[PDB]
Target: Vitamin D3 receptor
Amino acid sequence: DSLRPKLSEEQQRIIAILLDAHHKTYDPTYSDFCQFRPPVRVNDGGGSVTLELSQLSMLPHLADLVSYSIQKVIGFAKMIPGFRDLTSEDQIVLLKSSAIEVIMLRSNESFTMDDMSWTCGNQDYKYRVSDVTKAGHSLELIEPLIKFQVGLKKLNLHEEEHVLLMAICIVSPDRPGVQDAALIEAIQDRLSNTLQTYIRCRHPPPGSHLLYAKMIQKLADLRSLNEEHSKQYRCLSFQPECSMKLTPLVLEVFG
Ligand SMILES: C[C@H](CCCC(C)(C)O)[C@H]1CC[C@@H]2C(/C=C/C3=C[C@@H](O)[C@@H](CCCO)[C@H](O)C3)=CCC[C@@]21C
Model:
């Protein structure tokens, strides 16, 4: 029987708002990047945990890039229909625990399968596995992060699907420390129902109806990458003088 309800006026308005919020908080020209502390790539190739931790040569650049992105995510979240109805305490819980996951999601826009890099664009602002190891991370995080980016690219999401998946990621009732889980779940359900309906309505063949389960599985993968990131950030934080190379926002959000 397979019903395909039309998008309601409200679901249409939710999608419009989320598209606008994303266009206002994601610059696809990367024009701010010249403001970051500059990328430095030392001869590593080894490629040597000792040398990498000794220098952390790409960390000031990539920490500035991630701090800037956290600011853009705070901005995007504040525009999600319902998010402002939450207590400021739940807003912050949700932002701090989703921040790294939304950055991984939104970075898929600059990611290219041409050479498996995040291309912002350019030459100086092209980031590879080797650049991420020069910021103190290891293959345990980087390799599955690359797998994740390829997996997501190949979903070929509509922009409507991409912005809804980010909103659903942020408003998750199962984050540690949330207080009004039912309200967050209500907001999420409204977003998830919008996404489900959108996919049925708008996505060819179909049924690549199955697309919705694939997107939910990405949200599960993101939780595992978040835990690996936390482990590695802890290690990074033990490197003497590391805090200089980070930013106050990054320090707070991650520890
Ligand atoms: C795991 C790591 C975060 C490391 C953070 C640290 C050092 C704090 O632990 C990686 C996650 C992705 C990140 C990355 C590129 C990210 C982005 C590029 C553009 O698409 C961005 C700007 C768009 C304009 O708003 C988007 O926000 C994110 C490349 C190389 C690996 C990472 C540095």
User: Anything to note?
Assistant: The pocket of 90O is lined by residues 26-27, 62-63, 65-66, 69, 72, 103-104, 106-107, 109-110, 118, 120, 127, 132, 135, 229, 233, 250 (CB under 6 Å). The chain has eleven helices and three strands. The two ends are 51 Å apart (CA to CA).
